[PDB]
Swiss-Prot record, chains A, B:
The chain holds residues 2 to 224 of 413 of the full protein. Residues 15-18 are cytoplasmic. Phosphorylated on multiple threonine and serine residues. Phosphorylation may have a role in assembling connexins into connexons and gap junctional plaques, as well as channel gating. It comes from Ovis aries (Sheep). Disulfide bonds join 53-158, 60-152, 64-147. The chain crosses the membrane at residues 19-39, 71-91, 119-139, 168-188. This is Gap junction alpha-3 protein. Detected in eye lens (at protein level). Only detected in the lens. Not detected in heart, kidney, liver, or lung. Keywords: Cell junction, Cell membrane, Disulfide bond, Gap junction, Membrane, Phosphoprotein, Transmembrane, Transmembrane helix. The gene is GJA3.
Length: 193, 193
């Protein structure tokens, strides 16, 4: 996808942010957005095309792929990026609003509360997506999925495309997410002390 | 098949047999041999050809047809005919042997014991095939057979050719077999009294 606009806004955000925040935005751009576009989207491109079920039943592969993958991992990661970035956009907008207010007439007062809330929201959204992915997929895609959804007769064996590569990238993104959490914790403590 | 030779021998047997025995041989020829050749063999001709299993697994239809039908009904009926007819052949041979003995030099003495044993053996073989078929197939072929024999993955649904016609003929032959039993009982009692 085209992340250009979000890029513009977040680049603006870098200036009005802590050094650790600039590190966080670098991580977001490089290890999350760029990995997803350059590497992961191609991994998941044949997810349903090369999903195969051992059966002659029409409609079984469709319902089985749908039950195994209610949302694709890459779409989940898109949404995670958007939601962890939204607080930064809120804070940046409040900052620009105060600048416009000054013109009509760095981090302190209302902006400090807003920045702390921004880090907080980023952390909660962060953790939330991590836990949701754990409960939806664990952290390993196995090659076999056994499916008993109508119209499949009895239980059918279905086979995943590229499960090991997908597992590698699942874990890569989990690690990047954990690094982001650590960075946000560092921001909180660094402001505190 | 060509039952001509057995026919010759059994025709000979008719002369040296009771009236009820001639009825029994008429039943054998007409309602068992002729039905099998004229009607049933065509019913069972497509038994494996039109046996269908819902799967893509190579070898599953073969092992599933084999598990559902370890012996075909028509082959069972062939063997039943042969074995219920063998005692009559024994008795007829003993009779011809006594005739040859007389030439070298109706039912009484040794021939009477042999005739009673012939009826007995016919009755035991009769009942035995009936009970064996009950324990192997019951008396109704259902249209669905669920098969979990390797290499079939999990349980697969397989579908029988012509199950209702096959059931009709299964029951027809059961009835003919029971009529034969009744005739043999009548022979025993008629000799007794
Ligand atoms: C302003 C934020 C408002 C957040 C509102 C969140 C509302 C969550 C409602 C979840 C209802 C599940 C009902 C349930 O359980 O019926 C399914 C069964 O039971 C189960 O499978 C057990 C499912 C257990 C789900 C636990 C979800 C915890 C969500 C915590 C969110 C915290 C946000 C700060
Ligand atoms: C279905 C439970 O059935 P199952 O265990 O047999 O499916 C097994 C998992 N399989 C469906 C993927 C195969 O129900 C679920 O699992 C629902 C899991 C919900 C996962 C996360 C929802 C909240 C995400 C919040 C993100 C935003 C936070 C800011
Ligand atoms: C900044 C954050 C950094 C995070 C980096 C996380 C990278 C995670 C890399 C590997 C995850 C485990 C893969 C796995 O769990 O594989 C299981 C599979 C045996 O599973 P099974 O089917 O036999 O049961 O392993 C096998 O034996 C088959 C051979 C698999 C070798 C895969 C090597 C991947 C190397 C990637 C290096 C990335 C460098 C950045
Ligand atoms: C001169 C004639 C000689 C006849 C010799 C017949 C020998 C039959 C041996 C059957 C052994 C079954 C062993 C068994 O049972 O292991 C399988 C399990 O257990 C089960 O499933 C229970 C299976 C029960 C099978 C009952 C068969 C009764 C056969 C009566 C034949 C009468 C002929 C006059
Ligand atoms: C297999 C028991 O497994 P199942 O019940 O799951 O097979 C279910 C039946 N299905 C194999 C046809 C699907 O073992 C059996 O049934 C063995 C049954 C034996 C049937 C008759 C053997 C003696 C016939 C004597 C004839 C000659 C007398 C003079
Ligand atoms: C000397 C000895 C004489 C023995 C004569 C024995 C003849 C036995 C004839 C019928 C046996 C029952 C067939 C059956 O059991 O059929 C079940 C099926 C419903 O089963 P379902 O799938 O709905 O559960 O019946 C249905 O409704 C579908 C329609 C089936 C109609 C079949 C009519 C057959 C007429 C043959 C007449 C032969 C005259 C000699």
């Amino acid at each position: 996808g085209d992340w250009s606009f979000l890029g513009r806004l977040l680049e603006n955000a870098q200036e009005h942010s802590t050094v650790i925040g600039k590190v966080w935005l670098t991580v977001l751009f490089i290890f999350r957005i760029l990995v997803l576009g350059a590497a992961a989207e191609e991994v998941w491109g044949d997810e349903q095309s090369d999903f195969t079920c051992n059966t002659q039943q029409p409609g079984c592969e469709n319902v089985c792929y749908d039950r195994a993958f209610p949302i694709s991992h890459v779409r989940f990661w898109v949404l995670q990026i958007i939601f962890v970035s939204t607080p930064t956009l809120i804070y940046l907008g409040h900052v620009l609003h105060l600048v416009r207010m000054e013109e009509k007439r760095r981090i302190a007062g209302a902006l400090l509360r807003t920045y702390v809330f921004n880090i907080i929201f980023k952390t909660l959204f962060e953790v939330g997506f991590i836990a949701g992915q754990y409960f939806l997929y664990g952290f390993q895609l196995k090659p076999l999925y056994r499916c008993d959804r109508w119209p499949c007769p009895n239980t059918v064996d279905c086979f995943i495309s590229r499960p090991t590569e997908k597992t590698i990238f699942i874990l890569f993104m989990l690690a990047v997410a954990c690094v982001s959490l650590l960075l946000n914790v560092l921001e909180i403590y660094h402001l505190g002390w």
